[PDB]
Amino acid sequence: TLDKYSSEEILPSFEPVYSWSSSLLNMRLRNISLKSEHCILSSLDFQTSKASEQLTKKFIYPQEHNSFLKLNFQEISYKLIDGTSQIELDPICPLKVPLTAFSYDSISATFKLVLSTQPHRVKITLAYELELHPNLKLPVRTSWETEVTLTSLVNSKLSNVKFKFINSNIKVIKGEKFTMRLQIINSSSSPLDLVVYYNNTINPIPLTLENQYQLHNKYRKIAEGIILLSNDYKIPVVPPRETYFADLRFIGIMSGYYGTLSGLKVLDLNTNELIEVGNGASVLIQ
Amino acid sequence: KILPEQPQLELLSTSKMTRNSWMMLDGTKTDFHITVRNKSLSCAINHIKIIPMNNI
């Protein structure tokens, strides 16, 4: 609008028109995995922080020699997020969700969730209220997001054959003959002639006496705790890309917990391996 | 074209199997459990149909 502006410009007086020349509580999450059950236990834990102790005697109750807070947790929510999605996740044990708490307190909550290359996204929301005197109450609605960041099957060396017991965990009264089905998955190239055997021999010890006798007792218990009624078994044939059930029969004579039992070691009669398949068994004989 | 969300399944586990391998004795029948989880956080499937299918 230069024309309409310059036409509204106020011309000066005595001049020609134109001239040519010129944080009460602190909290964390200590999740732990479990490949035994293919699950991760995410355990949050929140405790009254040192700031609460500092402010106890400054404003809340300065005249008292020893005061304590009255934080009432109205809700402790654990949720999983996937974009806009949001779903609650219950805890293992019940939690009395209107939970009263005083100074120097700490509460833990453990949530189980299924376990590769896709980390989770968890929202933890604490809504509580400090309950100074019966009448007035100061609420807080804090929340925050993060990510859930952090043996039974046995393989063979220099091959691809795989071993597993159908029931790795079994309990049975002492002296009753039982059985554990050893599945032998062959997929490499060719049939095997592997042979199973159990040696009831005290392995020679290699150290103070406290370690030495512990170690000797360990081998003695291993050697003469359990026996295999089908020792020196010839597994008949396991053709390639097939499975076999080396059904074994045992009996125990010395009560205990033979977790990852040794002695039982199937050896391959093709390259003289000593693959220790005993690690897949966790017998408990009463 | 932009659809609504769709969920996913993963085959969490099978009870009496190891790497999806097992034997029969040519005449004995057996049974086991298949454990599957719905990975989606919002959607819920209202249809499932199972068709067995074999090598022969």
A171 — phi, psi (to 5°)? -120, 140
Resolution in A: 4.2
CA A66 to chain centre: 40
Question: Count of alpha carbons within 13 Å of B1, Cβ hemisphere only?
Answer: 1
Which residues lie closer than 8 Å to A88 by C-beta, 6 or more apart? Answer: A77, A78, A79
Q: Which residues does chain B have within 8 Å of residue A80's beta carbon, measured at their own beta carbons?
A: 41
Number of Cβ pairs < 8 A linking chain A and chain B: 31
CA A236 to chain centre: 41
Gap between the Cα atoms of B36 and B31, Å rounded: 16
Chain B: residue nearest A165 by CA? Answer: B18
Instruction: Verify whether the Cβ–Cβ distance B21 to A183 is below 8 Å.
Output: yes
* One-letter amino acid for residue A171 of the chain: K
Gap between the Cα atoms of A263 and A266, Å rounded: 9
Contact A285, A221 (CB under 8 A): no
Stretch 15-34 of chain B: residues touching chain A, C-beta under 8 Å:
16, 18-19, 21-23
- Give residue ranges of A with CB < 8 Å to any B CB: 38, 80-82, 84-87, 114, 153, 162, 164, 166, 183, 185, 243-245
How was this structure determined? It was done by cryo-EM
DSSP letters, chain A, are: -HHHHHTTS-PPSSS-S--S----EEEEE--EEETTTTEEEEEEEEEE-HHHHHHIIIIISSSSSS----EEEEEEEEEEEETTEEEE---SS---SSEEE-TT-EEEEEEEEE-------EEEEEEEEE--SSS--EEEEEEEEE------SEE-TTS--EEEETTS--EE-TT--EEEEEEEEE-SSS-B--EE-B----PPP---HHHHHHHHHHHHHHHTTEEETTTTEE---B-TTEEEEEEEEEEESS-EEEET--SB--B-TTTT----GGGG-EEEE-
What sign results for the dihedral spanned by CA atoms A223, A224, A228, A233?
positive
Chain A: residue nearest B22 by CA? Answer: A243
SS (H, E, C) A109-125: EEEEEECCCCCCCEEEE
Question: What is the number of other CB atoms lying within 10 angstroms of the CB of residue A183?
Answer: 22
Contact A203, A211 (CB under 8 A): no
Contact A152, A168 (CB under 8 A): yes
Count Cβ neighbours within 10 Å for each residue of A23-35 and write b for 16 or more, e otherwise.
ebbebebebeeee
Instruction: Verify whether the Cβ–Cβ distance A85 to B12 is below 8 Å.
Output: no
Find the radius of gyration of the CA atoms of chain A: 37
